[PDB]
Design a protein around this ligand. Structure first.
Ligand code: CLA
Ligand code: CLA
Ligand code: CLA
Ligand code: CLA
Ligand code: CLA
Ligand code: CLA
Ligand code: CLA
Ligand SMILES: CCCCCCCCCCCCCCCC(=O)OC[C@H](COP(=O)(O)OC[C@@H](O)CO)OC(=O)CCCCCCCCCCCCCCC
Ligand SMILES: CC1=C(/C=C/C(C)=C/C=C/C(C)=C/C=C/C=C(C)/C=C/C=C(C)/C=C/C2=C(C)CCCC2(C)C)C(C)(C)CCC1
Ligand SMILES: CC1=C(C/C=C(\C)CCC[C@H](C)CCC[C@H](C)CCCC(C)C)C(=O)c2ccccc2C1=O
Ligand SMILES: CCCCCCCCCCCCO[C@@H]1O[C@H](CO)[C@@H](O)[C@H](O)[C@H]1O
Ligand code: SF4
Ligand code: SF4
Lengths: 741, 119, 80, 59, 146, 38, 154
């Protein structure tokens, strides 16, 4: 049944245990006799299934910690609304968006760095936004500074409700585990209550705010003659002029004459030719479809009223012959082990963020988003990168399930461990697919590299040479051309203008051009399938060989973050289920580095740029992809040598901070290698040879100065390899596209 | 266990090794009779001499250029491993007759493919 | 073989034998310590050399010192 | 929505009664939630039939 | 750093603009801008989709030696026991497959021990490093002259 | 009562000293900018 | 040859070029824009920047070089902030050494280093002001150094 039992006055709220660092771990409350206690203090700050095995106390800790995370997010969005309010040129940006570059952050005038304040127009300078906040505010209908101030102060208000909520839900009203293992109610309220009322209420905001406002701004009204969203609901008369179905009220809704709501809601697709964004009639209609569809979706989980499913009777019913037991056990796995839930939710969250990137470049949903190309780039790139990292979090927390929370009694002959019976046949065929795709994704590049270098360009893989025209992608893209007349019957335009008709231009800037895919785009998709399969190899090898390998048959007895076993078996460095995640972060850097190096160079050759008189065309590199992506000298020369030139000449100007975050990120990238290659068997008596020089001058530190441990001494090589490696492409990309677009 | 069924066994059991009794020169001559017809293929359409009228002869010379390396590695494998003289494929003499069968049957398959690029 | 040698610092606390997942190490009654024990390594033919013993050797400095010697099938720990 | 002659509420109560006819079967207890669940299902079906009947052909 | 410094000194003497050095060598974008980005222009144009010239060997060696220098990092960073528990998967995949389990190894497939692993990562690091810089010295000075 | 012990720890006093000397550098470089003499 | 910097040609070329180059953005605004006042303050901070580098030595590069010989004409260039700096991290180093030889003799020296005893810390922070003739007089007692500490095999 469903009932909420809540402990009250769980933990006293004095600052006493803040004076005891490492109070939480009895393995770590001994105090630092060495400096490894300092880093183990932070490596055990959130090992919640290592504090105490009692899942009640753990579950209180995590559920209260989420409110801390949402508190930091409301401080973050209240920060973005205040930097939109006081510091941004958003009010002036709302007048002419295609001329004024978006800027919020206005750099304080200290030595030199006042030159970072870019005169982006609007009469007021500051460093240029690439996050695209102004496009979401024009979409959301924020008119003047007042809604940015007020929505910022409401952001701090919700931040106070999340700090007070998390304090309230760890200390003075914290629930039991029976509240938490009541998971049909949790899905029942997140499908329906969170996402259902979220999309429904957001359809309320778009119909009663954005459709009148972004009809008026689509008509080009200055941001003074625009009435407040306030004034559209005192009377329907200001909206019946704009959309004449508001005159009928809700009466055609309750009589189901929904043909009448073609003014407010429609299915057109394509893009607005005036603003370069999606039709907010289509977007508001869309959030109604998520509204009714998710409120349908929420009510399939029996909680108290004996109507709905339980997950147990679903997973038992799929008792397939080739698995034997069926899915028996997974409702007991996913309601007793948090790390498995974190594996699933980080996989689907990360892949959702990748889906977000791919759906934002080709269907740019905000007005004047595809006009300013840096906000179009970096919202592909950023969501691609967190969309990467969360999949490695799936590959880690799946293994953290498999090491800690695996129990073969509940998990006996089901769908799960029958994989692990033939995990040699899993990982071996991933090994084969990785070699086959590596040959047939990169050997083609060494081929075109040699044939172009050997002069015989007749033997390359270009359109002129031995072609590799992608057949399937061009065919289904041709289906997407033929959607809105044939199959999407009530549509007008296609799903995007990456598919079908001629390009959409706003302010002589190409918003979206139909992307052509020939014989170079092919091979880069096989790069992506390749380096996706390698991360899948390391992150399934990290899970199927997590608990008990055939090399080391007791890894659960060693743990998750153990470094190794020893020099035995000829050396067993880097063998834990954590160490595969260590590897999958480098392959994350590889895979996404060539995803965005496909994105930011195919769409600087095939989509973006300007249009001139008589509708004539001009790309940024000028069609320089298919003759140049086929090689690597074309890739490195014509992309990394040529697109760097606006990052490198950026000194003396407002783009020079990217000229600093470019070199410094090469420094951090290069600085990771010191941690990756060496190890603490060097640094420990290098350091102790310095401890002689402190013992001579009586400057012996009382906390004994060890070197780092092994797993920290490689985790930090990841976290510098990625910070420097990611911030190189960050500074390169924003300094490339701000310098032109 | 799985992919170990009677259709698996009935397909593998009549392959040109797992079949019961064939002389090793013919046992390898079947292997070369397949593979020599095979390896002419990916040198005619995609080879470097597909532009002149040596589209078909370069498949012969290049493919036998592979086959000498293939039988050479066959002689290395039977030279190093398979030391005993049980006279079958697990021997020296039966393996080198398996390799010689693969060579002569492979060159014969090369000539058969070359004379079937006529039609 | 990976030659395991067990010196006269071995005060017989038996975290070595409990730490060895190969049973190369056993305890021998040796009247030279307080526990009367001193570890022995008779079966070093199965000794991997993973040095899991030397981690759990709470002597002054490593009564049991593993020297990496021969590399057989069993001492390399290959499955096949 | 018109009166007693054939209209959109005419083709709704048949969906409601076949909905509760499902509610006699899908754990067919005679409680409140047979009607609140099952009249809701036949309500969903009726809404799927009314306007899906409106687009392709006569209402 | 020695030969980068010498080479960017004498590329400023031989071209003549020593003022190009002395004003733009005391900061790091002076090196990466004024030396590596500018002086790899005749290197990296070593062969185009338009054609090639005599420096295509040095640009092909250039990209080649970046590949050597990055195959070093597969051994230096990613150490053994990953591959020691992955060669076991390949050995299962060959022991279990039909038509090829006849062809069985004599020397058993074992991942490289970490005395060797850091060595071969070191060797690809040197070969990639030194072939990259011997590509760049000769392609650069052969491109600005001759 | 024991908050002042938390405000005596290593990272907090590290921020309350490097924040302070950081403010010495910035406030000493707004008042006297471009200071290469002396 | 290091010319005196106030008369070097390329120096004043950089004066005209940077005042004019930064001045090019100043005509993008009206006479009472806040940015226009900010670039007024910035032009002031460039003419002051180039007048306050008058007694330096900018050579043919037009960039002010330095001299680290202790020529006593270049003392404000290098040696005065040299002695100043050595005083400052002699302060810091003597504070840290004095605090470690405090916490070496306490109850629990481990907990002393996480939680700094801000009473005794800010005692030693301020008391370590005269480290030449206090560290030197603790050196003459044979107490700054040590002997027979830890070492490896030989
Ligand atoms: C329909 C009701 C409802 C709603 C709206 C939510 C919403 C949420 N839950 Mg949640 N939950 C619910 C019922 C609900 N839950 C029930 C019934 C259970 C028990 C089975 C849980 C158990 C649960 C867990 C275990 C966790 C969440 C978490 C979350 C948050 C996910 C983060 C997010 O999307 O940020 C978007 C943020 C918002 C949309 C702001 C939402 C704030 C509005 C005002 C709704 C909150 C109303 C509040 C729940 C009513 C409490 C009653 C009380 C005041 C008397 C989100 C706020 C996760 C989290 O982050 O913890 C907080 C988490 O770990 N929930
Ligand atoms: C640029 C350097 C580099 C290169 C080439 C590779 C290549 C490879 N890595 Mg890798 N790796 C690298 C750096 C590199 N890595 C780094 C820096 C890390 C640090 C984290 C890793 C970590 C890593 C892991 C963790 C794993 C790999 C794996 C693999 C293999 C994937 C299968 C494949 O693509 O086969 C195709 C091979 C190629 C594309 C290489 C080029 C081959 C050309 C095309 C053909 C042959 C050339 C020529 C004809 C040879 C004959 C001539 C010669 C004999 C004289 C592949 C060989 C995986 C593995 O074991 O295999 C599945 C694996 O699990 N790597
Ligand atoms: C791995 C990627 C790759 C691929 C696909 C190719 C492909 C090609 N290269 Mg090549 N090359 C590569 C990498 C690659 N190269 C690299 C990495 C280098 C540098 C080391 C070179 C250097 C190079 C040179 C220098 C030259 C070529 C040339 C060629 C062409 C002819 C070669 C030939 O005869 O093929 C031989 C093919 C075979 C022997 C076939 C074996 C593979 C078959 C198809 C496998 C089939 C198995 C089957 C599917 C099993 C399932 C069915 C079964 C169960 C029944 C061909 C297009 C030549 C040329 O002129 O180009 C036109 C040439 O001069 N290449
Ligand atoms: C398999 C591919 C495919 C996909 C993705 C769609 C997708 C869609 N079709 Mg569709 N359709 C398809 C094949 C497909 N159709 C075929 C093969 C036929 C012929 C029988 C139709 C006939 C068809 C009709 C008659 C209508 C749709 C409509 C629609 C849209 C509403 C969703 C829905 O079908 O309910 C949606 C975009 C509806 C629409 O256009 O509303 C937007 C609509 O009225 N479709
Ligand atoms: C038997 C009566 C009937 C009839 C004639 C229709 C007819 C239609 N329905 Mg439909 N529908 C029905 C019952 C019916 N429905 C029921 C009982 C449900 C469940 C509630 C639905 C749920 C449903 C959905 C969810 C959708 C349709 C849609 C459609 C339209 C396009 C279908 C297509 O692509 O082909 C078409 C007008 C689609 C559409 O485009 O609507 C216009 C669409 O998305 N129907
Ligand atoms: C902790 C470091 C620190 C220190 C030592 C000082 C010291 C000083 N500040 Mg100050 N300040 C600081 C941090 C600091 N500030 C921070 C973080 C801010 C941002 C909120 C400010 C904002 C600030 C303003 C706005 C002003 C000062 C002023 C002053 C001077 C007044 C006496 C003094 C030198 C005043 C002054 O003399 O400046 C003209 C003044 O007007 N400060
Ligand atoms: C108690 C303060 C203190 C003192 C007096 C010294 C003194 C010395 N260190 Mg040092 N050191 C310290 C802290 C200190 N160290 C810390 C915290 C670290 C870790 C980052 C190091 C790391 C370190 C290395 C790696 C090396 C030295 C070396 C040396 C010697 C040469 C001088 C030098 O270059 O310093 C080096 C100075 C630094 C690396 C940076 C300074 C460290 C911090 C930032 C300042 C210390 C202030 C301290 C934290 C204040 C705390 C007390 C206060 C709160 C009450 C000299 C005896 C070298 C040696 O052996 O030469 C013979 C050598 O190679 N030290
Ligand atoms: C997808 C087509 C796969 C056909 C498998 C059909 C299938 O999964 O049937 C389901 C079958 C399980 O059979 P049962 O009837 O036991 O299944 C019911 C139970 O699974 C539910 O309890 O799984 C397999 O046989 C596993 C075979 C994996 C063998 C490798 C397949 C993966 C290779 C293809 C990877 C392609 C991904 C890209 C897709 C384009
Ligand atoms: C796709 C597919 C497939 C595959 C394919 C293949 C695998 C093929 C093969 C085929 C082949 C591969 C063929 C062969 C041919 C051959 C023949 C028909 C024979 C004849 C004979 C010969 C060649 C002879 C030779 C010679 C000469 C000429 C002279 C003297 C010497 C000798 C006798 C050696 C299958 C069916 C599985 C299934 C379905 C699908
Ligand atoms: C350099 C290096 C070290 C040495 C790193 C040292 C131990 C850490 C240096 C940074 C710490 C944070 C210095 C401590 C200083 C304190 C922060 C106090 C300073 C005062 C203020 C800054 C607060 C390793 O321990 C190591 C381990 C394994 C593989 C490679 C390596 C490795 O390459
Ligand atoms: C046969 C008699 C039918 C009478 C039909 C009346 C239709 C509307 C029913 C509700 C009456 C009030 O109408 C509302 O008016 C408000 C504002 O006054 C708006 O919500 C809508 O117009 C109606 O809902
Ligand atoms: S040596 Fe160390 S570990 Fe081995 S027994 Fe004596 S004490 Fe226990
Ligand atoms: S060597 Fe490896 S196996 Fe032999 S004892 Fe020491 S640890 Fe146990």
């Amino acid at each position: 049944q469903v009932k909420v039992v809540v402990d009250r006055d769980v933990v006293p709220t004095s600052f006493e245990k803040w004076a005891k660092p490492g109070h939480f771990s009895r393995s770590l409350a001994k105090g630092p006799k060495t400096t490894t206690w300092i880093w183990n203090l932070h490596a055990d700050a959130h090992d919640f299934d290592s504090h105490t095995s009692s899942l009640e106390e753990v579950s209180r800790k995590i559920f209260s910690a989420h409110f801390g995370q949402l508190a930091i997010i409301f401080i973050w969005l209240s920060g973005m609304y205040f930097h939109g309010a006081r510091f941004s040129n958003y009010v002036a940006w709302l007048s002419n968006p295609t001329g004024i570059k978006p800027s919020a952050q206005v750099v304080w005038p200290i030595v030199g760095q006042q030159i970072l304040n870019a005169d982006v127009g609007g009469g007021m300078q500051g460093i240029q936004i690439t996050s695209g906040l102004f496009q979401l505010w024009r979409a959301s209908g924020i008119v003047n500074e007042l809604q940015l101030y007020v929505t910022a102060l409401g952001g701090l208000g919700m931040a106070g409700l999340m700090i007070f909520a998390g304090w309230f839900h760890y200390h003075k009203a914290a629930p039991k585990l029976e509240w938490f293992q009541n998971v049909e109610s949790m899905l029942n309220h997140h499908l329906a209550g969170l996402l259902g009322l979220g999309s429904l209420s957001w359809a309320g905001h778009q119909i009663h705010v954005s459709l009148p406002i972004n009809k008026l701004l689509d008509a080009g009204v200055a941001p003074s003659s625009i009435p407040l969203p306030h004034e559209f609901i005192l009377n329907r008369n200001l909206m019946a002029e704009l959309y004449p179905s508001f005159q009928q009220g809700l009466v055609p809704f309750f009589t189901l004459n929904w043909k009448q709501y073609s003014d407010i809601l429609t299915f057109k697709g394509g893009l607005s030719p005036v603003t370069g964004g999606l039709w907010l009639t289509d977007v508001a209609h869309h959030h109604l479809a998520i509204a009714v569809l998710f409120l349908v979706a929420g009510h399939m989980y029996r909680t108290n009223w004996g109507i709905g499913h339980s997950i147990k009777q679903i997973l038992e019913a799929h008792k397939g012959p080739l698995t034997g037991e069926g899915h028996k056990g997974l409702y007991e796995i996913l309601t007793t082990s948090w790390h498995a839930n974190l594996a699933i939710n980080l996989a689907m969250l990360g892949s959702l963020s990748i889906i977000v990137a791919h759906h934002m470049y080709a269907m740019p949903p905000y007005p004047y988003l595809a006009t300013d190309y840096p906000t179009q780039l970096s919202l592909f790139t950023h969501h691609m990168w967190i969309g990467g990292f969360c999949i490695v979090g799936a590959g880690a927390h799946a293994a953290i399930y498999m090491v800690r929370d695996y129990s073969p009694t509940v998990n006996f002959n089901n769908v799960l461990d029958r994989m692990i019976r033939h995990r040699d046949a899993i990982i071996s065929h991933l090994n084969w697919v990785c070699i086959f795709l590596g040959m047939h994704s990169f050997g083609l590049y060494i081929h075109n590299d040699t044939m172009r270098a050997l002069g015989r360009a007749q033997d390359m893989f270009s359109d002129t040479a031995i072609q590799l025209q992608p057949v399937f992608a061009q065919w289904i893209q041709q289906i997407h051309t033929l959607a809105p007349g044939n199959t999407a019957v009530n549509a007008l335009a296609t799903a995007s203008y990456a598919f079908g008709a001629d390009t959409v231009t706003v302010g002589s800037k190409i918003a979206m051009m139909p992307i052509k895919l020939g014989t170079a785009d092919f091979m880069v998709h096989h790069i992506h399938a390749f380096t996706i399969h390698v991360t899948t190899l390391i992150l399934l090898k990290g899970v199927l060989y997590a608990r008990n390998s055939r090399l080391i048959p007791d890894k659960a007895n060693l743990g998750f973050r153990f470094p190794c076993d020893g020099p035995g078996r000829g050396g067993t460095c880097q063998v834990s289920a954590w160490d595969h995640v260590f590897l999958g972060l480098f392959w994350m850097y590889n895979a996404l580095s060539i995803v965005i190096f496909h994105f930011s160079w195919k769409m600087q050759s095939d989509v973006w740029g300007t249009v001139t008189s008589n509708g004539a065309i001009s790309h940024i590199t000028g069609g320089n992809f298919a003759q140049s992506a086929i090689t690597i000298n074309g890739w490195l020369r014509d992309f990394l040598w040529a697109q760097a030139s606006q990052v490198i000449q950026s000194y003396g100007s407002s783009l020079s901070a990217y000229g600093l975050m470019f070199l410094g990120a090469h420094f951090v990238w290069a600085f990771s290698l010191m941690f990756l290659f060496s190890g603490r068997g060097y640094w420990q008596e290098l350091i102790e040879s310095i401890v002689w020089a402190h013992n001579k001058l009586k400057v012996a530190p009382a906390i004994a100065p060890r070197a780092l441990s092994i797993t920290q001494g490689r985790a930090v090589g990841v976290a510098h390899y990625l910070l420097g490696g990611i911030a190189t492409t960050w500074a390169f990309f924003l300094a490339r596209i701000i310098a032109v677009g | 266990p799985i992919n170990s069924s009677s259709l698996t066994r009935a397909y593998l059991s009549q392959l040109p090794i797992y079949r019961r009794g064939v002389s090793p020169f013919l046992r390898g001559l079947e292997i070369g009779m397949a593979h020599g017809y095979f390896l002419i293929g990916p040198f005619v359409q995609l080879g470097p001499l597909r532009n002149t009228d040596i589209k078909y002869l370069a498949g012969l010379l290049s493919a036998i250029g592979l086959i000498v390396i293939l039988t050479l590695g066959m002689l290395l494998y039977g030279a190093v491993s398979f030391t005993n003289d049980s006279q079958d494929l697990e021997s020296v003499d039966g393996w080198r007759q398996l390799a010689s069968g693969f060579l002569l049957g492979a060159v014969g398959g090369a000539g058969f493919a070359y004379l079937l690029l006529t039609l | 073989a990976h030659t395991v040698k067990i010196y006269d610092n071995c005060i017989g606390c038996t975290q070595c034998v409990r730490a060895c997942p190969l049973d190369v190490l056993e305890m021998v009654p040796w009247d030279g310590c307080k526990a009367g024990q001193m570890a022995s390594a008779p079966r070093t033919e199965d000794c991997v050399g993973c040095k899991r013993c030397e981690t759990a050797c709470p002597t002054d400095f490593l009564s049991i010192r593993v020297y990496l010697g021969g590399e057989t099938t069993r001492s390399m720990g290959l499955a096949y | 929505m018109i009166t007693i002659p054939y209209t959109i509420p005419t083709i709704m109560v048949i969906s409601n009664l076949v909905g509760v006819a499902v509610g006699r079967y899908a754990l067919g207890r005679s409680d409140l939630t047979q009607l609140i669940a099952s009249m809701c299902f036949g309500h969903i079906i009726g809404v799927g039939i009314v306007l899906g009947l409106s687009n392709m052909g006569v209402i | 750093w020695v030969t980068f410094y010498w080479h960017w000194k004498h590329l400023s003497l031989w071209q003549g603009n020593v003022a190009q050095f002395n004003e733009s060598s005391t900061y790091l974008m002076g090196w990466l801008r004024d030396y590596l980005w500018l002086n790899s222009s005749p290197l990296i144009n070593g062969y185009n989709p338009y054609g090639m010239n005599s420096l295509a060997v040095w640009s092909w060696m250039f990209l080649f030696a970046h590949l050597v220098w990055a195959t070093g990092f597969m051994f230096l960073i990613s150490w053994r026991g990953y591959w020691q528990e992955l060669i076991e998967t390949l050995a299962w995949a060959h022991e279990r497959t039909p038509l090829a389990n006849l062809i069985r190894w004599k020397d058993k497939p074992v991942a490289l021990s970490i005395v060797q692993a850091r060595l071969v990562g070191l060797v690809h690091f040197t070969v990639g490093y030194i072939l990259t810089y011997a590509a760049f010295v000769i392609a650069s000075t052969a491109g600005k002259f001759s | 009562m024991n908050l002042k012990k938390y405000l005596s720890t290593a990272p907090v006093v590290a921020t309350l000293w490097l924040f302070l000397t950081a403010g010495i550098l910035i406030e000493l470089n707004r008042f006297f900018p471009d200071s290469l003499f002396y | 040859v290091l010319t005196p910097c106030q008369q070097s040609e390329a120096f004043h070329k950089r004066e005209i070029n940077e005042v004019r180059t930064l001045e090019n953005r100043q005509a993008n605004y009206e006479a009472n824009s806040p940015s226009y006042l900010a670039l007024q303050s910035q032009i002031d901070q460039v003419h002051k920047r180039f007048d306050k580098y008058g007694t330096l030595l900018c050579g043919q590069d037009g960039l002010p070089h330095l001299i680290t010989d202790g020529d006593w004409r270049h003392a404000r260039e290098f040696t005065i902030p040299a002695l100043l700096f050595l005083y400052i991290t002699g302060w810091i180093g003597w504070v840290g050494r004095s605090y470690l030889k405090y916490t070496k003799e306490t109850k629990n020296p481990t907990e002393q280093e996480i939680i700094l005893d801000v009473p005794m810390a800010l005692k030693y922070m301020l008391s370590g002001f005269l480290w030449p003739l206090s560290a030197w007089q603790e050196y003459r007692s044979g107490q700054l150094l040590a002997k027979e500490d830890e070492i490896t095999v030989s």
